[PDB]
Every structure is written in C-alpha cells, then in structure tokens.
Amino acid sequence: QSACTLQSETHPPLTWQKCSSGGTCTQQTGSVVIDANWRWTHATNSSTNCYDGNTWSSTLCPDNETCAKNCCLDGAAYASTYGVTTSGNSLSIDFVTQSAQKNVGARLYLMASDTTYQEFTLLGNEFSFDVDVSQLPCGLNGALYFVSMDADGGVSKYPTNTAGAKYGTGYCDSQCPRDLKFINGQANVEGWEPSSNNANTGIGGHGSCCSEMDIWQANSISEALTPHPCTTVGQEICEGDGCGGTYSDNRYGGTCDPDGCDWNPYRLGNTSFYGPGSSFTLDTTKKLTVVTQFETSGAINRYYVQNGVTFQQPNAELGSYSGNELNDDYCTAEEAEFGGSSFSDKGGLTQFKKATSGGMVLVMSLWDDYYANMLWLDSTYPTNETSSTPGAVRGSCSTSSGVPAQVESQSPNAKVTFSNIKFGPIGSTGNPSG
Amino acid sequence: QSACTLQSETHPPLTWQKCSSGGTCTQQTGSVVIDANWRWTHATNSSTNCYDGNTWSSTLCPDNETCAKNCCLDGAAYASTYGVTTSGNSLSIDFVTQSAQKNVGARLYLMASDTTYQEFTLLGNEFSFDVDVSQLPCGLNGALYFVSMDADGGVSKYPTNTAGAKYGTGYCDSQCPRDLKFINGQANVEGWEPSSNNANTGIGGHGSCCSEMDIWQANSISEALTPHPCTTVGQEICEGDGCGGTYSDNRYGGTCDPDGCDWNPYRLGNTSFYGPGSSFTLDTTKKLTVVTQFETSGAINRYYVQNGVTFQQPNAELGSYSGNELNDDYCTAEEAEFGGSSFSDKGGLTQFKKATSGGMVLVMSLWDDYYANMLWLDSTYPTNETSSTPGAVRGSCSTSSGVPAQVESQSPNAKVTFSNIKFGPIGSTGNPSG
Numbered sequence: 050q051s052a053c054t055l056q057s058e059t060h061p062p063l064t065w066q067k068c069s070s071g072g073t074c075t076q077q078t079g080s081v082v083i084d085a086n087w088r089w090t091h092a093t094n095s096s097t098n099c100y101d102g103n104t105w106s107s108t109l110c111p112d113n114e115t116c117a118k119n120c121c122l123d124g125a126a127y128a129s130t131y132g133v134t135t136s137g138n139s140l141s142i143d144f145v146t147q148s149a150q151k152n153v154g155a156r157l158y159l160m161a162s163d164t165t166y167q168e169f170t171l172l173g174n175e176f177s178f179d180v181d182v183s184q185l186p187c188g189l190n191g192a193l194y195f196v197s198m199d200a201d202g203g204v205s206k207y208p209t210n211t212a213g214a215k216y217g218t219g220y221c222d223s224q225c226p227r228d229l230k231f232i233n234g235q236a237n238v239e240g241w242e243p244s245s246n247n248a249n250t251g252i253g254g255h256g257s258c259c260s261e262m263d264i265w266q267a268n269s270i271s272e273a274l275t276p277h278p279c280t281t282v283g284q285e286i287c288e289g290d291g292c293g294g295t296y297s298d299n300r301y302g303g304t305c306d307p308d309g310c311d312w313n314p315y316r317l318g319n320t321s322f323y324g325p326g327s328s329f330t331l332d333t334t335k336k337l338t339v340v341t342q343f344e345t346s347g348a349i350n351r352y353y354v355q356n357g358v359t360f361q362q363p364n365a366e367l368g369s370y371s372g373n374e375l376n377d378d379y380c381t382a383e384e385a386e387f388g389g390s391s392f393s394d395k396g397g398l399t400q401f402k403k404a405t406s407g408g409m410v411l412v413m414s415l416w417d418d419y420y421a422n423m424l425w426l427d428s429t430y431p432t433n434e435t436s437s438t439p440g441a442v443r444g445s446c447s448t449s450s451g452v453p454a455q456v457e458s459q460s461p462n463a464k465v466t467f468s469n470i471k472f473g474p475i476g477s478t479g480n481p482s483g
Numbered sequence: 484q485s486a487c488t489l490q491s492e493t494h495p496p497l498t499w500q501k502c503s504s505g506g507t508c509t510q511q512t513g514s515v516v517i518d519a520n521w522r523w524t525h526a527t528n529s530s531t532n533c534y535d536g537n538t539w540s541s542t543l544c545p546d547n548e549t550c551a552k553n554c555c556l557d558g559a560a561y562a563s564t565y566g567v568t569t570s571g572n573s574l575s576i577d578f579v580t581q582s583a584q585k586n587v588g589a590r591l592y593l594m595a596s597d598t599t600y601q602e603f604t605l606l607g608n609e610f611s612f613d614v615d616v617s618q619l620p621c622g623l624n625g626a627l628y629f630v631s632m633d634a635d636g637g638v639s640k641y642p643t644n645t646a647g648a649k650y651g652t653g654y655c656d657s658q659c660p661r662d663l664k665f666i667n668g669q670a671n672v673e674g675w676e677p678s679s680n681n682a683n684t685g686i687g688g689h690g691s692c693c694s695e696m697d698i699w700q701a702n703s704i705s706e707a708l709t710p711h712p713c714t715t716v717g718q719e720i721c722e723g724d725g726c727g728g729t730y731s732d733n734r735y736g737g738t739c740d741p742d743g744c745d746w747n748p749y750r751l752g753n754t755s756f757y758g759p760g761s762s763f764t765l766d767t768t769k770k771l772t773v774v775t776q777f778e779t780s781g782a783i784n785r786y787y788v789q790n791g792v793t794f795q796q797p798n799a800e801l802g803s804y805s806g807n808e809l810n811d812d813y814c815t816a817e818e819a820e821f822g823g824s825s826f827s828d829k830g831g832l833t834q835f836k837k838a839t840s841g842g843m844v845l846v847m848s849l850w851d852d853y854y855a856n857m858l859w860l861d862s863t864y865p866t867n868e869t870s871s872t873p874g875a876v877r878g879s880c881s882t883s884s885g886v887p888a889q890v891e892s893q894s895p896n897a898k899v900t901f902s903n904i905k906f907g908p909i910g911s912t913g914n915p916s917g
C-alpha cells in the first residue's frame with residue numbers, strides 16, 4: 050500500500066532509558082505508531098474506502114496486487130479516534146473509544162525516527178517497565194512484547210509497500226496472523242472471509258509469521274511470560290491453513306509455535322502471587338515494576354518491584370523441574386506435564402535465542418479475544434476441564450467471562466498504562482534514570 | 484581430641500539476616516568460632532604442650548590415636564590473641580596480632596549454637612555480604628566461603644573427638660588440607676613434616692577433603708569467585724600424596740578439584756572493574772556489597788552494589804563462551820583456553836550442585852600464602868609467563884609480592900571486615916533488614 054494524507058500522521062512521542070554497565074542511564078526520544086490494520090484504507094485518488102466493515106471493495110480490490118496499487122493507508126487521530134495518549138515516558142491505551150465510529154483497543158510500535166522502528170537486541174540485556182493493570186478486568190489483555198519485524202516495516206523487500214513503518218506496516222507474530230489487510234506490499238483480499246463475530250475483521254489467504262517474545266500479557270487477574278520460536282526467525286509470509294496459528298483450521302501446521310513456553314505463576318500453582326488487593330504478593334490495584342533478563346544461555350529471568358519491595362519470579366515445581374528461571378528444563382517439563390510438543394518441535398529456547406540475538410521491535414497493545422475470550426490467560430481452559438487437569442486453571446475468572454461484545458459494553462473505560470521503559474545490560478536498569 | 488578449660492571459650496556473637504520470598508527479613512543470632520589449628524593443644528592433665536612451634540611431643544604423641552587420647556584443645560582469647568572482634572552484624576580479623584606470641588590471621592566458622600555449626604543450603608538461594616578490603620594489600624586474602632563440614636565438627640562419626648564444633652574441629656576443603664593437626668578424632672602426627680618456611684606449621688600423613696564454594700577470595704587488588712567439586716561431596720579423610728591439593732607432591736592425584744572453575748574479572752580481561760580508587764568501577768578503598776545467587780540449574784550469578792549503584796558481574800568472552808553467568812559453558816571454555824582438566828574430571832557444576840543442594844558451613848578467614856605468595860590471585864602466575872599466555876595475569880601485583888615474612892613485617896595492621904550478612908531465596912536479600 051501507499052500512504053495518503055487526508056489525515057495527518059503525528060506519532061505521539063515517548064521517551065525511554067538506555068542504561069549502561071557502568072551504572073548510568075541516558076534518555077532516548079522515540080514515539081509510537083499505530084498498526085496499519087487500525088487505519089482507514091482508501092483509494093489513492095479519492096475518499097472511497099478500499100475496506101469497510103469487514104469486506105473489501107470488489108472493484109478497487111479485485112486481487113491482491115491491484116488492491117495494493119489502488120489503495121493507501123491514512124493518518125490516525127491518536128487520542129480522539131484511538132484512545133492512545135502519551136506523556137513523557139508514559140503511554141495509555143483506552144479500551145473502547147467512541148468517535149464517528151467505535152474503536153476497540155490498539156497495537157502500537159516504538160519508533161526510532163518518524164519512518165523507522167526501534168530495534169532492540171534482547172540477548173545479554175534486560176528490559177524494565179512499569180505497568181498499571183488496575184483497570185483491566187477479566188477478558189482483557191494489556192500486552193508488552195517483541196517481534197522480529199523489519200525496521201522499515203517491509204519497504205526494502207516489498208517496494209509496492211511505500212507506506213512503511215511510518216504507517217505501522219510489516220507486522221508479524223507467532224500466530225502467523227491472517228487478519229492483516231496488507232502483507233508483503235500486497236493486500237490480503239484473496240481468500241478473504243469475514244469474521245462471524247467481529248464486524249470489523251476477517252481472515253485472508255495469507256499470514257505473516259515471525260518470532261515473538263511475550264514479556265507481558267496480563268490483566269488485573271493473571272499475567273504470563275512466553276517465548277515463541279519459529280523455524281524462520283524473521284518476518285515471512287505463509288499460505289492459508291499452512292500458516293497454522295489462531296486464524297487457521299490446524300493450529301500446529303505451520304512454521305511458528307503459537308503456544309510458546311508460557312510461565313503464568315497462577316497456572317503453575319501460586320494462586321496468591323498476583324491479583325487485586327492486599328491478599329496478593331503483588332497488588333494489581335497499584336502500579337508495579339516488571340524486569341525481564343535475557344541471559345546468554347538463552348534462559349529468561351524475571352523479578353518484580355512494588356513499593357520498593359523486590360520479588361523474584363515465584364518458584365515452581367513441575368515434574369523434575371524446580372526453580373524460577375524459564376529455561377530448557379522448565380519448557381521440557383511443561384510439555385511433559387501439561388501436554389503439547391509445539392515449542393520443542395519449533396526448536397525451543399535454542400531456536401528462540403536466534404531471535405533475541407537479532408533485532409526485535411517493541412509492541413504495546415490492548416485487546417479482547419474474539420477467538421477464545423482470553424480464557425487461556427485468566428480462566429480455566431479448555432472450559433470443560435477441571436482443576437484436576439494439570440495446567441487447566443490459569444486464573445480465577447469465570448469460564449463465561451471475556452465475551453468481546455459484553456466486555457466492550459460493560460467495561461468501555463478499561464485501559465492500560467505502560468511507563469518508565471528502561472533497557473540495557475543485565476543488572477543495569479535499576480540504576481538512576483538520566 | 485578432647486577439650487580443656489584452662490582458657491575459657493566465649494564465641495564472639497554475630498547476627499545475620501534470613502530473608503523470605505514474601506519480602507521481609509528477620510534477624511538471626513549466631514557467633515563465630517576459631518578453627519582448632521589456631522588453638523593451644525596440650526596434655527589433658529597438665530599445661531605441657533602436645534604441639535609446639537611445628538613439632539609434636541614425641542612422648543605425648545607417639546602415634547595418632549595415643550596423641551588424641553592424651554591431648555586437648557583449649558579456649559581462645561579472640562581479641563587479644565587472635566585479633567578477632569565482632570559488633571552486631573560485623574566481624575573484623577586483624578592480620579598480625581602480638582601477644583605473648585605472634586599470631587597470623589584466623590579461620591572462623593559461623594555457629595548455630597555454642598556447640599554446633601550453622602548449615603546453609605545454597606541451591607535456589609542467594610548470599611549477600613558487605614566487605615571492606617581497603618586494608619588488604621598484595622599477598623593477602625580476606626576470604627568468605629562455604630565447605631561441606633559436619634554440623635557437629637565430626638563428633639558423631641569420631642567419638643575420640645569430644646571437642647567438636649565448639650572448638651572448631653572438623654575442617655575440610657577442596658585442597659584436602661594436610662596441615663590440620665587433628666582429623667577424624669585422631670592426631671596427624673604420623674608422617675608429620677615441619678614446614679621449611681613456616682615456624683608454626685607442617686604437613687601430616689592425613690588430609691581432610693570436601694566440596695568448597697569460594698564466594699570471595701580477595702584483597703584490594705583482585706577478587707575471585709570459585710566453585711570446587713569433589714567426588715565425595717562431604718568431609719572425607721585422605722592418605723598422603725593421594726590427597727592431592729596444595730599440600731601434596733601431585734596436585735591432581737586426589738578426590739577434590741584444587742583449582743576450581745574460577746571467575747576473576749581481571750584474569751578474564753576487565754582490568755578496570757575492581758581496584759583502589761576512582762579509576763575502577765568498584766573502588767576498593769570503600770565498602771562494597773557482594774551478592775551471589777545459586778540458580779537451580781547449578782549456574783552461579785553475581786552482582787555488586789556500591790554507593791547505591793548496581794553492577795552485574797562484568798561480561799567476559801572466552802573461546803565460544805560469552806556472558807556473565809558462571810555456568811557449564813564458561814567452565815568448559817575456561818579449561819579449553821587457560822588449560823587444565825581438574826574441574827571437569829571432578830564432575831564440574833553437576834557434581835558441585837550436590838554440595839549446594841546439601842548443607843554447607845560458612846567460613847571467614849584472613850591469610851597469607853606460604854606455598855605461592857597469593858600470586859595465583861593477584862599477580863602473574865606462574866611467574867615466568869607473560870601477558871601473552873592466556874589467563875596468566877590475574878592482577879597488577881608484582882611477581883615478587885606476598886612473601887609471608889615480608890608482608891607480616893610490613894603490613895601487620897592489615898585487616899578485613901565482613902558485615903551485613905543476608906541469606907534467603909534468590910531476589911530476597913535486597914529487601915529491608917528486620
């Protein structure tokens with residue numbers, strides 16, 4: 050797609066700290082950009098929509114190539130349309146924003162310049178952020194994560210994409226998402242099927258795959274840390290059900306691991322660690338600090354700080370595994386006890402290390418779940434299982450929770466705030482901000 | 484040996500903090516006891532010495548069993564004889580103390596009660612302490628470490644030892660030391676050879692072996708972190724040169740690894756990390772905090788705090804190894820690049836994990852080195868090597884430094900102070916002391 054300018058594009062600014070092993074941190078200035086799927090897509094020559102509701106213009110978009118030639122992405126009114134605001138080092142995303150139309154959530158990328166994404170090499174480094182999840186009820190996910198996207202959003206590889214990172218192109222993740230309207234500088238109109246339950250979305254014949262580091266998928270009830278390996282590390286198109294992932298018939302018939310090696314302290318048995326109020330170790334009515342460390346072995350370490358008190362990731366015992374480090378032994382034990390082979394089939398932490406050794410783009414989002422109502426995060430899943438099934442219970446939410454239309458109607462003012470992002474060598478980010 | 488009471492035994496008290504995963508720490512009250520080798524050893528029935536200078540009484544001690552029956556250990560005047568003092572959570576050890584006789588240094592164990600050693604299970608936990616090394620010049624070693632000693636100092640296994648932990652019996656370490664005067668409730672007079680260079684010491688026909696975790700061996704110039712595995716995890720007697728270690732002909736002909744997998748940041752190439760004054764990352768003229776974490780994988784992590792600034796162990800690159808975690812890959816790369824096979828022959832970190840999974844006793848000591856002048860810690864070693872030999876340079880001290888008689892004469896007022904010991908689950912010890 051190209052870019053149009055009927056609506057101006059001003060990326061909300063966002064600062065973050067780059068820390069050094071020598072003990073100081075220095076401020077960096079970036080900004081955030083909304084993903085292309087949230088944008089108005091119209092004819093290059095007029096205000097006629099190329100996509101409206103969940104269907105494509107059959108005349109503007111008779112095939113993927115013609116569609117991309119005829120159509121452009123336009124600018125975003127971040128606050129009034131999308132409920133996205135920033136202040137200094139803080140970013141807030143509102144759940145439902147009513148303007149001329151209703152918008153639900155957002156997916157945002159941290160930029161290096163007006164036209165390029167910021168890339169982070171996670172291996173050997175740590176990432177710290179503060180989060181307020183107090184306004185996230187059952188069924189919602191305020192997410193902070195990394196994906197192996199191109200810094201230009203795909204322009205160099207696909208010259209029919211001239212919109213680029215400036216307009217939030219080039220997304221990929223470990224679900225090989227097929228809901229994207231543009232992939233590899235082509236539309237995704239071929240094979241398009243409108244969603245049965247979402248007036249705004251559908252599934253196309255192509256998907257976009259890459260490695261994904263889910264540092265944080267969470268609401269006020271549950272939180273999970275999850276690496277997802279793929280056999281191709283970076284962004285790669287996939288065809289139809291061969292994509293695998295959430296948007297396909299066969300979840301496991303592709304190049305990515307859609308399940309990941311997840312660590313949810315509640316799922317692992319510590320039901321007192323994280324939740325609303327003073328009966329939990331971390332009180333989710335209050336802001337908390339989350340630090341994630343990527344040691345060179347490929348294992349992941351985690352600690353939290355709230356009100357000046359520090360907590361390592363809680364210990365878990367699972368089969369022969371015992372500890373609080375997300376390592377090979379943990380992931381292997383998880384598969385053995387909870388089931389599945391996706392993570393290990395895709396190469397486990399060794400394959401994942403190839404992603405963290407390279408550059409990844411920072412994503413912050415707020416979403417509800419039209420496929421599984423977020424039950425995999427905060428409830429019992431599948432819903433017919435009981436607590437006697439190992440790993441079935443992931444949180445205290447009802448198996449009836451998270452219906453998108455219901456949570457959109459009841460909790461429109463839900464929101465997430467991410468702040469005080471700090472990045473640098475392991476051991477460096479607790480030092481004073483500069 | 485038995486215990487006598489011509490001199491009373493009052494263990495200087497010492498407090499330390501036990502921390503919990505829930506974020507609080509609670510004070511514990513222990514004390515310290517001096518090792519039996521420093522004590523006066525005399526006839527049970529009189530004040531006649533069983534050992535004097537570096538020779539045994541041929542009449543009281545004609546063989547190991549008769550010697551142990553005839554002889555006892557007596558009490559220690561901690562401050563006036565040994566230069567050992569405590570105040571609250573702080574312990575100081577002076578280098579040379581002049582009383583009726585000259586004493587050099589001390590080796591001390593943390594006690595649980597007046598008659599038993601405190602045991603710590605290191606695996607899954609972390610150990611934090613503060614240290615002032617400013618008064619430790621080249622050739623000195625203020626050491627804090629753990630060994631797999633019996634809590635009773637050997638009494639239950641060897642009933643001819645009735646003196647026990649109260650009198651500091653039962654020592655062992657990875658050098659299988661043969662300088663000990665009593666091992667396994669027998670004297671070590673058989674095969675005794677006086678030291679050629681130390682008026683107070685010798686080498687006997689028996690040694691005492693066990694696993695050793697050297698958290699801290701250091702002076703103002705250099706510091707090292709070193710696990711040492713043994714094929715028998717706990718205390719075990721050894722025979723003659725079959726002992727291996729520093730006190731034997733063949734260093735490597737025994738059950739323990741006398742070399743260990745050492746991590747000295749200077750040895751690994753970072754010559755700016757630790758030293759006297761503001762030109763170093765950690766200024767050794769000032770107190771510093773040292774934290775050591777024993778993850779369940781068997782790897783060891785380390786960070787430091789000085790003046791509120793936190794530093795992870797510096798990154799090192801060695802062969803194919805890159806990182807700051809002391810793990811299997813590091814130890815294997817070290818052997819490949821610096822040479823040696825002792826650590827891996829003895830089972831490496833896997834065998835070492837058997838020690839940290841069990842109980843170990845906390846040792847604090849101050850010593851000079853009558854075998855190698857501490858050159859292996861703070862100089863170039865062996866002394867004929869140059870900086871072009873990988874790992875030869877371990878510190879900036881001259882290869883002429885550390886002659887015991889010289890440093891004892893020039894630096895008698897040298898000292899080390901260890902303080903603010905905190906122990907608990909990984910992530911817990913930075914929380915407020917209680």
Ligand SMILES: O[C@@H]1[C@@H](O)[C@H](O[C@@H]2CO[C@@H](O[C@@H]3CO[C@@H](O)[C@H](O)[C@H]3O)[C@H](O)[C@H]2O)OC[C@H]1O
Nearest residue numbers: 086087088089090100101151152153154228249
């Ligand atoms: O015509 C434009 C609309 O399409 C646009 O609607 C937004 C479309 O994206 C919606 O978010 C989806 C949430 O699920 C993700 O997986 C998808 O990638 C997203 O497409 C968003 O909720 C809608 O508001 O609004 C502007 C119109 O001009």
Ligand SMILES: O[C@@H]1[C@@H](O)[C@H](O[C@@H]2CO[C@@H](O[C@@H]3CO[C@@H](O)[C@H](O)[C@H]3O)[C@H](O)[C@H]2O)OC[C@H]1O
Nearest residue numbers: 520521522523524534535585586587588662683
């Ligand atoms: O007779 C008693 C003396 O023997 C005692 O002298 C102390 C003996 O121990 C000395 O320290 C050695 C240092 O090296 C270690 O490897 C050895 O295990 C120790 O023996 C210490 O320096 C001497 O003061 O003093 C009291 C006398 O009654």
Ligand SMILES: *[C@@H]1O[C@H](CO)[C@@H](O)[C@H](O)[C@H]1NC(C)=O
Nearest residue numbers: 070071753754755756764797
């Ligand atoms: C030494 O380590 C410190 C702390 O990690 C680091 O800041 C510094 O750059 C390192 N210097 C060298 C020469 O490796």
Ligand SMILES: *[C@@H]1O[C@H](CO)[C@@H](O)[C@H](O)[C@H]1NC(C)=O
Nearest residue numbers: 319320321322330363504505
């Ligand atoms: C949960 O984790 C916290 C923090 O480590 C710990 O203090 C608590 O004992 C754990 N509770 C359970 C039930 O595992």
Ligand SMILES: [Co+2]
Nearest residue numbers: 254255287288
């Ligand atoms: Co195709």
Ligand SMILES: [Co+2]
Nearest residue numbers: 344348778782
């Ligand atoms: Co580790």
Ligand SMILES: [Co+2]
Nearest residue numbers: 688689721722
């Ligand atoms: Co014998």
